[PDB]
């Protein structure tokens, strides 16, 4: 019944950010695994690492809160919902929040985020904006 | 697995007492059932008047049955002019 | 002490989820790590109050608990600043100008009953005037010498005292004070975990406040 | 009670300890529908058992669609001997 694992994980980490958890658990898959390492590269998150079991794995995230108890995370948004996919051309990649926002896009040359995707002229479905 | 409790009115000689309890046991054992236990209470003052008897005779018959003898026992007891009241209870 | 004075904690676990989430399970004192974190906390508050009082600011002392009110009152006396002992009347600091123009009446009438002409009607005014002194001084207490807004606070029970802590939060006073296990931390800048039932240790803990604020000046 | 289902599972025996086999499940389903059907015919207005009838028949038919999707051959050799359409 749970339709989009990306949306599930996305609003789960949003919900933990809004309530100041340091601990958070996410049931594992390859797609959210590399979205985890992409977010680790972009530094919105302290650390992510994986442990495995008999049921598709399980991943955990350590989430940052800046220097003075403030939200490093100011919101998240899913776009490529199921039932209504969305695609954009390589030159039509949206500069979300005119630069300070970051968009994650599944492209024909793997999944990369907004700036290097624009730099290497990739394109595809815009998946999530983070503000 | 069914435990039976029925009342006959006291104004009965012991010749017919054994007669009625015996023929009801033959009814139960002839309708395919087997008697796993019998018990007796004898005399006991009723909680209330039923027809004109202040008193009554109490008897316990424990039978393991295949749910075929109890309905016919029910109709025999209720058509019998010597049994006042009776029930049948599933013991589980 | 680095040891427990009367630090046996709180009786009933009807309490506030804020910081007490995963502290080790030994007894009803589920937050037993307060024993070992209190010492570093009070020493940090100790050096902080040391340099702010060495700068020249003024602390004052608020508490209406039935067991600690006179204890902190006498502590305010021999430490040498202000206090509130009895009823925290509404909005003392956000009503500072009105409060001092009421305390001016107390100063004038106490100097009148000290050296002024006492009698113009030696019953009909003097008797309720003599009443009015202690009448205002009861709920007032140690408000006789502010002349200036104080720049810090210490509270024994911010649970009982919402009015003072909210007033300070509006008036950007840095609020310091101890925290009973039912209270709420993050609305207070520096919190010190302390059980309110410690009727004996409640004065020693702020005695460790008082010698710091005494040592800060000289 | 439970004797008919036990003989049905050990007759639709495929794997050594299978109870999760779809072919195993629809057999117990078929006997449930038939027991309830000759129940309903003597008790027509037992609507609260009509509902369970509808539940089990819907579960039966959509898991049959699953079995068709999985392998229609064993479906055919199930359907011919169990006898319904």
């Amino acid at each position: 019944v749970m339709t989009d694992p990306i949306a599930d994980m996305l609003t789960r980490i949003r919900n933990a950010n809004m309530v100041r958890h340091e601990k958070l658990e996410i049931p594992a898959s390859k797609l959210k695994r590399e979205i985890a390492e992409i977010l680790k590269r972009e530094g919105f998150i302290r650390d992510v690492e994986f442990v495995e079991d008999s049921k598709q794995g399980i991943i955990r995230v350590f989430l940052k809160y800046g220097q003075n108890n403030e939200r490093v995370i100011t919101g998240l948004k899913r776009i490529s919902k199921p039932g209504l996919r969305v695609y954009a051309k390589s030159n039509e990649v949206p500069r979300v929040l005119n630069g300070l926002g970051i968009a994650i896009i599944s492209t024909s040359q793997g999944v990369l985020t907004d700036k290097e995707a624009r730099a290497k002229q990739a394109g595809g479905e815009v998946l999530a904006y983070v503000w | 697995k069914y435990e039976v409790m029925y009342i006959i009115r006291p104004n009965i000689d012991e010749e017919s007492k054994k007669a009625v309890i015996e023929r009801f046991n033959n009814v139960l054992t002839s309708n395919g059932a087997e008697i796993t236990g019998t018990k007796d209470w004898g005399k006991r003052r009723l909680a209330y008047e039923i027809n004109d008897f202040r008193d009554g005779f109490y008897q316990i018959v424990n039978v393991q049955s295949d749910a075929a003898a109890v309905q016919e026992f029910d109709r025999l007891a209720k058509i019998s002019d010597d049994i006042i009241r009776h029930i049948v209870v599933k013991e589980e | 002490l680095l040891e427990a004075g009367v630090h046996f904690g709180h009786q009933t676990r009807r309490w506030n989820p804020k910081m007490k989430r995963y502290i080790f399970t030994e007894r009803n004192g589920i937050y037993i790590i307060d024993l070992q974190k209190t010492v570093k906390k009070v020493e940090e508050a100790y050096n902080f109050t040391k340099n702010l009082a060495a700068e020249g600011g003024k602390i004052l002392f608020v508490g209406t608990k039935k067991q600690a009110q006179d204890s902190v009152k006498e502590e305010a006396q021999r430490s040498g600043m202000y206090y509130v002992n009895q009823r925290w009347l509404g909005g003392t600091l956000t009503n500072f100008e009105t409060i001092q123009k009421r305390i001016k009446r107390l100063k004038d009438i106490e100097k009148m009953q000290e050296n002024g002409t006492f009698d113009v009607l030696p019953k009909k005014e003097v008797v309720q005037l003599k009443k009015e002194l202690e009448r205002l001084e009861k709920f007032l207490g140690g408000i006789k010498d502010m002349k200036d807004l104080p720049d810090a606070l210490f509270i024994i029970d911010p649970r009982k005292e919402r009015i003072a802590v909210a007033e300070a939060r509006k008036l950007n006073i840095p609020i310091i004070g101890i925290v009973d296990t039912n209270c709420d931390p993050d609305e207070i800048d520096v919190v010190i975990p302390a059980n309110d039932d410690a009727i004996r240790a409640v004065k020693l803990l702020t005695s460790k406040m008082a010698d710091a604020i005494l040592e800060a000046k000289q | 009670t439970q004797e008919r289902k036990n003989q049905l599972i050990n007759e639709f025996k495929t794997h050594e300890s299978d109870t999760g086999s779809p072919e195993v499940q629809i057999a117990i389903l078929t006997d449930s529908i038939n027991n309830l059907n000759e129940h309903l015919r003597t008790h027509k207005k037992d609507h609260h058992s009509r509902r369970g009838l509808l539940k089990m028949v819907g579960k039966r038919r959509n898991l049959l669609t699953y079995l068709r999707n999985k392998d229609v051959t064993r479906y055919r050799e199930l359907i011919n001997k169990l006898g319904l359409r």
Partner: protein, 64 residues
């Protein structure tokens, strides 16, 4: 506040034995509720069913 049946851990009622039902029925003939008996919840219903079959069997009276 004391539940009799858990107090000695007695199992199912065995309706033929009556003397406990005697002191669970009021002297005017009604069932004492849990406010005065203080039994466990899951036994009160089998109790009232037991005294009901006793009343049909005429060992315990409807009115007294």
């Amino acid at each position: 506040k004391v539940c009799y049946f858990t107090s000695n851990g007695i199992t199912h009622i065995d309706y033929k034995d009556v003397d406990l039902l005697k002191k669970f029925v009021s002297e005017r003939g009604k069932i004492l509720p849990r406010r005065v008996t203080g039994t466990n919840a899951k036994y009160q219903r089998k109790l009232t069913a037991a005294i009901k079959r006793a009343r049909q069997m005429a060992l315990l009276p409807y009115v007294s």
